[PDB]
């Protein structure tokens, strides 16, 4: 699937251009199609909250916890693999975002310290065991739902929550349990 990887590289390029005080025009990223730029735009709009793809980027927040933008994706993949994800699967997910162990990510910083310490200290995640796995934290259970995280998890690599039968059923049951 070279075109998804192409959109990912274009997204990395647009992120580098956005963080630094550098402009972003179509001809600039042409040499470095419409499906690929639309994919880069969807990735920027969902993972980082960057709307427009000469272009002009407009953001959403990013009392600002920009790195916490990573949280709902993670809570998604954990919910995708039942309710607990292997650390290897988590790192595989972090890779397509461009975040690598011991690497200073452009926005997240070093990802291991952020996801096994910060998000754990904040009760958003749990990181337990010589193999480790990630699970939802109590803050996650309190501040979002299985249905909202399923909506997010489907919005990328999917379309609707109904495409996941068992997951949509579990989110319905979770909504019924919460209403009590």
């Amino acid at each position, epitope marked *: 699937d070279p075109v998804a990887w192409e959109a990912g590289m274009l997204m990395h390029f647009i992120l580098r251009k956005y963080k630094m005080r550098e402009p972003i025009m179509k001809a600039d990223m042409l040499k470095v199609f419409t499906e690929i730029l639309n994919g880069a735009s969807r990735r920027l709009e969902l993972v980082f909250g960057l709307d427009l793809k000469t272009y002009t980027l407009v953001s959403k927040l990013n*009392w600002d916890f920009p790195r916490n*933008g990573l*949280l709902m994706p993670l809570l998604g993949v954990i919910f995708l693999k039942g309710n607990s994800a292997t650390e290897e699967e988590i790192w595989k997910f972090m890779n397509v975002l461009g975040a690598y162990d011991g690497e200073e990510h452009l926005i997240y910083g070093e990802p291991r310290k952020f996801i096994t310490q910060d998000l754990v200290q904040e009760k*958003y995640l749990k990181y337990e065991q010589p193999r480790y796995q990630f699970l939802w934290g109590p803050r996650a259970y309190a*501040e979002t*739902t299985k249905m909202k995280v399923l909506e997010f998890l489907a919005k990328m690599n999917g379309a609707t929550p109904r495409d996941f039968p068992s997951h949509y059923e579990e989110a319905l049951r979770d909504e019924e349990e919460r209403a*009590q």
Partner: nanobody
Amino acid sequence: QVQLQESGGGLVQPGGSLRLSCAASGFTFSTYAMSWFRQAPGKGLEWVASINSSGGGIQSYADSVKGRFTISRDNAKNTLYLQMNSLEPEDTAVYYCAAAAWRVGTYDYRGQGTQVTVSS
């Protein structure tokens, strides 16, 4: 339009109790998960507690307060409550009330806060 108004702060002797309230207007209070944060003198913002929407049956607390603070909500009054028992001087801080955003890990609205001072 939207407003979160915290109230109930003041001086309190250690080991005593105090109820903080947060009145919410301009949005559907019952829809948002709510949180209490606090900022101590010369320290950063610290998450205190969180409670879910749609029944409020899921509470979460920091370890510093787990056995002593109690978050609750009245949807009919659009009000959030933080009951603080067995208070300690560490608990001296400005306390803020904040509505959790749909993108979990961020927040849409926050109040102006109320000062809680624990000293004998």
